[PDB]
Amino acid sequence: PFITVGQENSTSIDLYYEDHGTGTPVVLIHGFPLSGHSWERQSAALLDAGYRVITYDRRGFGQSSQPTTGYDYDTFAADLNTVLETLDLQDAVLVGFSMGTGEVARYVSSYGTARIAAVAFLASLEPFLLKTDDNPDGAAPQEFFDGIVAAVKADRYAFYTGFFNDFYNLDENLGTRISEEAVRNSWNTAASGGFFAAAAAPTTWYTDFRADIPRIDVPALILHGTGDRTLPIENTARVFHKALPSAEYVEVEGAPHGLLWTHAEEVNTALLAFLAKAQEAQKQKLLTEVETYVLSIIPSGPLKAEIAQRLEDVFAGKNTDLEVLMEWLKTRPILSPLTKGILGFVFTLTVPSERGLQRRRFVQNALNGNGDPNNMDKAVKLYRKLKREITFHGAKEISLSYSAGALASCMGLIYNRMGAVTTEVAFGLVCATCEQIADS
Amino acid sequence: PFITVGQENSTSIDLYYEDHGTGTPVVLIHGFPLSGHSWERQSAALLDAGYRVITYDRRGFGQSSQPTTGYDYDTFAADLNTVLETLDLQDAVLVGFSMGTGEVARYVSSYGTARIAAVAFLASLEPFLLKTDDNPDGAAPQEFFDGIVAAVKADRYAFYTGFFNDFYNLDENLGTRISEEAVRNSWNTAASGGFFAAAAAPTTWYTDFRADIPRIDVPALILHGTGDRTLPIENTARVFHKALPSAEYVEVEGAPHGLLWTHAEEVNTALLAFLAKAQEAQKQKLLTEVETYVLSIIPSGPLKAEIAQRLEDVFAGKNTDLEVLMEWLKTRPILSPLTKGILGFVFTLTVPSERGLQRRRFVQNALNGNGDPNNMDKAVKLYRKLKREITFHGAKEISLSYSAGALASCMGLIYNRMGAVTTEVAFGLVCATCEQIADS
Amino acid sequence: PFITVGQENSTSIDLYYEDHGTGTPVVLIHGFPLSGHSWERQSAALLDAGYRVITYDRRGFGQSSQPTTGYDYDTFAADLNTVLETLDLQDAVLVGFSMGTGEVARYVSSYGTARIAAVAFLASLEPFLLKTDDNPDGAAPQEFFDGIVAAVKADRYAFYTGFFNDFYNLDENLGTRISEEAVRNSWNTAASGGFFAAAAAPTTWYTDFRADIPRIDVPALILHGTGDRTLPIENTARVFHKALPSAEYVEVEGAPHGLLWTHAEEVNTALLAFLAKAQEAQKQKLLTEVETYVLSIIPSGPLKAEIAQRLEDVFAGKNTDLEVLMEWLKTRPILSPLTKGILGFVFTLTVPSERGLQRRRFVQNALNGNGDPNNMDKAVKLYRKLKREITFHGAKEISLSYSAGALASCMGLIYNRMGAVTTEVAFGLVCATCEQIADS
Amino acid sequence: PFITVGQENSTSIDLYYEDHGTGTPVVLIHGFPLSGHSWERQSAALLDAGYRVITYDRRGFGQSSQPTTGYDYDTFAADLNTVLETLDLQDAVLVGFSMGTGEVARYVSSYGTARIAAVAFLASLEPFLLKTDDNPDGAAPQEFFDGIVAAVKADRYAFYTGFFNDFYNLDENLGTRISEEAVRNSWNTAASGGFFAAAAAPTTWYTDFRADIPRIDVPALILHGTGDRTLPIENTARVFHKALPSAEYVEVEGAPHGLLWTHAEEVNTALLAFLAKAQEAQKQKLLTEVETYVLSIIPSGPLKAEIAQRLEDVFAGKNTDLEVLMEWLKTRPILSPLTKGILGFVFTLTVPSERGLQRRRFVQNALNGNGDPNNMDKAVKLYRKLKREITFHGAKEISLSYSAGALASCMGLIYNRMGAVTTEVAFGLVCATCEQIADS
């Protein structure tokens, strides 16, 4: 699997990617000098959690093409952009490691978090490695990095064994947290990389990401190992934590630079928990917004209080029996059938378990759309547009163009399992329907 | 060289295959966790014997794609099917090793031996690995296999060194039957495989192949090592031999699981001898097939009995004077000239000695094809295809697309020494010709 | 990166190549049993010297296809030819190593030095390895070569460690001139090769290249190590030097067979110096061609002489102050504004240092293209094509299809850093522009 | 079989033609007042020589339409033109008799010998029948021709019997050179013709063809009977021979006007000999043209001389053993494999006997065309066009539009019997291929 992201001479620059599982897309950007396969400890964990894992090898690494041009984060980000846009990812998560954290920050800064839902920085480069007078928080001076490039250029194959010795802290973790064979694989992967990329990459490590950080608006995670020899905890993540206080901060005690393997247990737990909290966070801001739209079509009274109470209860996690709620809903006086249908449509959408409960009859007859063929013809045209939509504001605003009768019919069209749209889109259709009713 | 056998989200599942040599197609399916390149000891041998070696890497192994789905023999066989159908192999031989034996058994069972001429099971999984109450012939209980999967998931790279230690019986064969460097290569191949496939594959080893075995009708070969630690000789091949007594049975004394390399000497000898006997077997089955087709265009009577008898006599070895047969053939009443031509073409093909007899005149004028330029133009196009053919079924099935008049002309095209094709191909043209005449 | 050079049954014979840098094309043909990546010591050096490095893996080696047919230098040359003709290289340099030297000689002999400007033979096979009665200068008898093939067929993986032991003279150079890791990588590369190619290749080493040598007319280089164990200096290069006295002869003191890595220092120095005489020639012919095009749009007078003189001055290396040149240029009477822009665009292109000089105002307003959107729409369409261009002749001829207004605008489009094209391509755009003006 | 060559208000002017045999097209134009069937003596003979006999009936004669307009040689030639172009004849020979000779002269003169390879004039009308002061070589005065027209208009049926008495010289040849029954058939044919054409035709006999004769550039033949009463030998053919000395001149002793039947023996001998010399003529001009093109891709040396010598030997008739040539060809140093393939393709084409030699292996792999699918796709498209081609220049010029790689593949497409084209076309493909190689 490859993805053209550029062109070099007679050749074209292709990047070996890998997309597995089904669900919320999680893009994993690796570090130096490994490849996407280095994520295998996390890949399995994310896949077991029902995510969609997407990994790719950076240019000049792994199975990607090995050009002698374009080794800068402006290019590295452009590559990531092409990948995201080629796969057309939406509400995706960017997880970076080593070099990878730089790609994430730069992409967010340059291209914006349109497709991004959350970000994670494992063993970060941010905000700035280069140690200068104006940047005293820098890890090392210019001379140091120039030394690495020269070291790589001398004998890159010999460089790797020494490199990996501080990458995993083998004087501590070899035989225990990382096997002999596991290191040998890392070496082979390092050798498989491009000779030019191997020497070019180090100059990119001291990139100034300070300008990029303020552009990070989506929920972020900053994880780092205290025993990181390559990227000192104080010169990297701790100063990054100050530049981004809103980000969730995690310090793994005594973890080397390559904590992805040595401390896979902790890294997975922290990463999975973060994605869980971010999914729930954006879900709750969505549900409450849906609530206000739903309440906007309910006459002010003690019944509106009950409905608002039952909505807050299911949104929180106080799982009420879906059968009980629907039973209560149908037997409500002074409530429009259309309103009951909208409510029933919302309750089925939000309640975690369907509990083998068949689609309620009173909702179907409410969202039938008068059984008028004209209402359904409009509904199908709308459904076609809602299929290619993934965002709330996007789906809702294009739905407001259709009549209230068509919207109601289109809603039952989804309720009766005849149509499929993402939950966010469905909420948009609900809110758009409630908005039509709120006018009259 | 790859062959798409599936699709996995944005990517497509491609399998790296390899087709070399010219002759009888022999498909080699490898085992866990190596690739098609592990056959290199056998590949060379088959090539030196004039066979056509075709090897491919299983999904998640070798250079094939590494998907996270479809790790079951129903998929593995379906994959194999796509390969066979894409190359359009005819009279092909399926040879399986370790996991490979499962694909052969399952394919034959599900898809049938239409394209298959013979099969071979080296280090078999059959009939059933899983040890239960209803299946006491099982090698190991469920707990054993679950233990392997967990071990792989822990550190697959570390797992390999231990795995290969019982794979080659290194405490016995290292330094003698298998070099240190050779093992190192096998490990790299194991590491190159998919991380997911490595953990998924063990669960497929205890597949119940008992239902598959009875479907095996083509000549079979059962080779196995007595010193096989992974797959105990008694729990696998010996009980497999009972379920298939007709199969040629070979036990290599003191051979490990990976006898393909350690005991390549013995394996080559047994396989080459087996392929010789099976091809010779189907050749006798071929002559009888030719007879029934020729008789299918001859009107039932006392003459039809004589013709059938004279065919049986020459096929057996009762060498009749070629001149006498031709003399008798021509001087037959109630026999179509076209029928005399077909018979005459067969008699020249089967009789061992030509005895300096010049091409019969009555045969040429019978297969001339009315002297029609259009019929010959079609004949040449068919002859071109029949030259690159080596198998009966291959030549026969591609000839059935041409008109009966073109087939008759193409037969005479070969009779007049204007064309040269292998005996099997020529028979294919005869059976295809007789098939068209039997319709009218 | 691949290049189809043949076909074998269902598969196609593809060779993994690699084209980097911009300038004089230098093709690097590797030896047994490595791949193009082994040139990395020279590749980096040649790239730093402004050459265009093109490397490819021979059939059955590296990432190229592994056929079991066509392992002879007549085929090896046919492969190289396809590579050369596909990339359409002109004035190219062929550098061969080990087996590579054979490919070079045979191509020149059979196809001629039409595309070739110079050749280099490192660790040559020439003129003849096989020791016979008619060739007493042979290195080793027939039995020797037959022994190697038998050794490879026996255990190619074990063979490699032994082969590489004399390839680098590890008893002398291991730990000093070549690291442990470096050899380990070479072994992996050797294993990655085709099993069949590994055994077939040795039979090609004793090819008679004596008939091929006289066809070498382009300037040649013969480098060889005195401590070359695989190919003895006296049996190979010294007798080759006699058959080709005009060739520059270099003997690296105490260098093994794999001098490309162990003695890269000397090899680079010798190769670069040889290539240097050739590089400057083709570079100056390009600049003078640019000059004559520029002079072709300047009205004949005392001013035309000055411009021609100032162009020759910067072309040679008499770097005049860029600010001074621009200053003189703008304040010139009888000079078209468009002409001033073209000149200003050339001076910035040729002058080695930009000297922090901001983009000149008079040039931007000269290459603005009348501010017409239509001129820019054409310019953008042209710029898109010029991005994928690499050659002067290639970029120039496709630019002549656009209007003079579009070319001028596209020129400023690049001048304003809004576009990026290689220097050769930019010159093509200039020459294409001057050619349009010379018509009116 | 008819061919519309004109139009009438309600009728359409159709001419009954006839095309038989396969090979070089020979158009036979009859005389007054017979039809194409009078050529039956010549038709049978020419067919036995492997020619393509094409005969047609002139307007108002035989089975052709019988219009009352357009009875002049400007129209008669235009009719012939329509016939030739409709059948798209190439390298055709025009043979005329009586009136027919005028059509040949007029067509060649006005439309040119584009499709014409050679011409023949049997019982010529040329150059001028009308006897005047400026043309004293005229056969008869105006009064004579006017007398014929009046005789026909009086009683055309009675006219025929008298006419045929001088047509065949019945006072000498009746009962001997022409039977009673043979004449009776001619009378019927004369009667079947149009009444108007019978009277109109004589006025066309005294057409001035003096302006047309110089246009004859193709090799010509002038046959005539000494006892020709209708057209006196001296007033027609002998003065024509002076106006065209290059033409082959044949005088049949004691032959009447209708020598086509009476002296069919002699006419056949002379015509067959003339066509043989003309058919061979273009073949020798072709072989020498192919040679120079083939030699144009061979490097100048002692080898170029040998190849040129061996080509002259096979072209001549010194049939060298085909196997020997191929054996010599393959074992040639300093010769490109592609060149060896081209040469081998030519040698198989030119050598009269194939000697049961199977298609050479070294040629197939040389003309494979790199095994590139794109090259074959181009090859097939070119092959489609080459099938409808019959001429060298025609096939060659349309082949020059395809790439050299496609041309090489298309050549092997024909060599491997996968395609069928006339020898002239194949040569065209060869010369077109050699032309591309000579450029680089």
Between chains, do B380 and D416 touch, taking CB under 8 Å as contact?
A: no
Amino acid at A25: P
Architecture label for domain C280-366: Up-down Bundle (1.20)
Q: Tell whether A14 is within 8 A of chain B (Cβ).
A: no
Strand order of the β-sheet with C116-122 is C2-8, C11-19, C52-56, C25-29, C92-97, C116-122, C220-225, C248-252
The method recorded for this entry reads X-ray
Between chains, do A161 and C182 touch, taking CB under 8 Å as contact?
A: no
Active site (annotated) includes residue D228:
yes
Nearest to C343 by CA among C356, C357, C332: C332
Architecture label for domain C1-279: 3-Layer(aba) Sandwich (3.40)
Between chains, do B417 and D22 touch, taking CB under 8 Å as contact?
A: no
Active site (annotated) includes residue C37:
no
Nearest CA in chain C to D333: C211
Q: Tell whether B184 is within 8 A of chain C (Cβ).
A: yes
* Catalytic-labelled residue, pool D65, D98, D124, D409: D98
Residues of A in contact with B67 (CB under 8 A): 20
Facing D335 at nearest CB: one of C8, C13, C110: C110
Q: Tell whether C74 is within 8 A of chain D (Cβ).
A: yes
Strand order of the β-sheet with A2-8 is A2-8, A11-20, A52-56, A25-29, A92-97, A116-122, A220-225, A248-252
The residues with which D249 forms a beta bridge, in sequence order, are D222
Residues of B in contact with A182 (CB under 8 A): 155, 157-158
Between chains, do B420 and D22 touch, taking CB under 8 Å as contact?
A: no
Facing D420 at nearest CB: one of B377, B417, B420: B377
Q: Which residues of C315-337 are buried (b: 16+ CB within 10 A; e: fewer)?
A: beeeeeebeebbeebbeeeebee
Active site (annotated) includes residue C257:
yes
* Catalytic-labelled residue, pool A65, A257, A263, A409: A257
Residues of C in contact with B52 (CB under 8 A): 9
CATH number of C367-440: 1.10.10.180
Between chains, do C19 and A7 touch, taking CB under 8 Å as contact?
A: no
Between chains, do D336 and C111 touch, taking CB under 8 Å as contact?
A: yes
Residues of C in contact with D373 (CB under 8 A): 12
Beta carbons within 8 Å of B181's beta carbon, 6+ residues apart: C155, C157, C158, C160, C161, C187
Between chains, do C18 and A7 touch, taking CB under 8 Å as contact?
A: no
Facing C68 at nearest CB: one of B21, B181, B185: B21
Nearest CA in chain B to C10: B19
Q: Determine how many CB atoms are found less than 10 A away from the CB of residue C166.
A: 15
| Terminal Cα distance for chain B, rounded | 45
Query: Phi and psi dihedrals of B223, rounded to 5?
Result: -110, 145
* Domain boundaries, given as residue ranges, for chain D: 1-279, 280-366, 367-440
Chains that touch D (3 or more CB pairs under 8 A): B, C
Residues of A in contact with B160 (CB under 8 A): 181
Q: Tell whether A191 is within 8 A of chain C (Cβ).
A: yes
Angle at C312 (CA atoms; ends C308, C315), nearest 5 degrees: 140
Residue that is written with structure tokens 């790439």 in the block: D403
Q: Tell whether A52 is within 8 A of chain B (Cβ).
A: yes
Interface of B with D in 344-373 (CB under 8 A): 373
Between chains, do B384 and D417 touch, taking CB under 8 Å as contact?
A: yes
How close D415 comes to chain C (CA, Å)?
A: 18
Q: Are B20 and C68 in contact (CB under 8 A)?
A: yes
Residue that is written with structure tokens 């158009």 in the block: D27
Between chains, do C8 and B22 touch, taking CB under 8 Å as contact?
A: no
* Catalytic-labelled residue, pool B257, B393, B399, B409: B257
CA pair distance B258, A313, nearest whole angstrom: 62
The residues with which C54 forms a beta bridge, in sequence order, are C19, C27
Please report which helix (H) or strand (E) contains residue B126, including its range.
none
CA pair distance B248, B310, nearest whole angstrom: 34
**How far apart, in Å, are the Cα atoms of D94 and each of A216, D5, D104, D342?**
89, 18, 6, 35
* Catalytic-labelled residue, pool D257, D263, D399, D409: D257
Cα radius of gyration (chain D): 26
Nearest CA in chain B to A179: B158
DSSP reduced 3-state for B294: helix
How close A436 comes to chain C (CA, Å)?
A: 45
- Chains D and A make contact, 3+ CB pairs within 8 Å: no
Q: Are D395 and D389 in contact (CB under 8 A)?
A: yes
Between chains, do C215 and D333 touch, taking CB under 8 Å as contact?
A: no
Between chains, do A20 and B160 touch, taking CB under 8 Å as contact?
A: no
Residues of D in contact with B383 (CB under 8 A): 417
Q: Tell whether C188 is within 8 A of chain B (Cβ).
A: yes
Residue that is written with structure tokens 């004793």 in the block: C206
DSSP reduced 3-state for B386: helix
Chains that touch A (3 or more CB pairs under 8 A): B, C
Residues of A in contact with B196 (CB under 8 A): 20, 43-44, 47
Between chains, do A65 and C390 touch, taking CB under 8 Å as contact?
A: no
**Both tokens assigned to B316:** 């057996």
How close C246 comes to chain B (CA, Å)?
A: 44
Q: Three-state SS string across chain C, please?
A: CEEEEEEECCEEEEEEEEECCCCCEEEEECCCCCCHHHHHHHHHHHHHCCCEEEEECCCCCCCCCCCCCCCCHHHHHHHHHHHHHHHCCCCEEEEEECHHHHHHHHHHHHHCCCCEEEEEEECCCCCCCECCCCCCCCCECHHHHHHHHHHHHHHHHHHHHHHHHHHCCHHHHECCCECHHHHHHHHHHHHHCCHHHHHHCHHHHCCCCCCCHHHCCCCEEEEEECCCCCCCHHHHHHHHHHHCCCCEEEEECCCCCCHHHHCHHHHHHHHHHHHHHHHHHHHHHHHHHHHHHHHCCCCCCHHHHHHHHHHHHHHHCCCCCHHHHHHHHHCCCCCCHHHHHHHHHHHHHHCCCCCCCCCCHHHHCCCCCCCCHHHHHHHHHHHHHHHCCCCHHHHHHHHCCCCHHHHHHHHHHHHCCCCCCCHHHHHHHHHHHHHHHHHC
Nearest CA in chain C to A161: C181
Nearest CA in chain C to A193: C37
Nearest to B117 by CA among B2, B27, B244, B195: B27
Burial of A358 (0-12, 13-18, 19+ CB in 10 A): exposed
Q: Which residues of D81-109 are buried (b: 16+ CB within 10 A; e: fewer)?
A: bbbbeebebbbbbbbbbbbbbbbbbbbbb
Nearest CA in chain B to D357: B418
Nearest CA in chain C to D297: C111
Judged by phi (left if over 0) then psi (alpha if -120 to 50, else beta), residue A353 lies in beta
Interface of D with C in 285-304 (CB under 8 A): 299
Amino acid at B93: V
Between chains, do C182 and A155 touch, taking CB under 8 Å as contact?
A: yes
Q: Tell whether C14 is within 8 A of chain D (Cβ).
A: no
Nearest to A271 by CA among A94, A21, A115: A94
CA pair distance A53, A28, nearest whole angstrom: 7
Facing B1 at nearest CB: one of C65, C153, C157: C65
* Catalytic-labelled residue, pool C64, C65, C98, C109: C98
Residues of C in contact with B182 (CB under 8 A): 155, 157-158
How close A187 comes to chain B (CA, Å)?
A: 12
Query: Phi and psi dihedrals of B11, rounded to 5?
Result: -95, 170
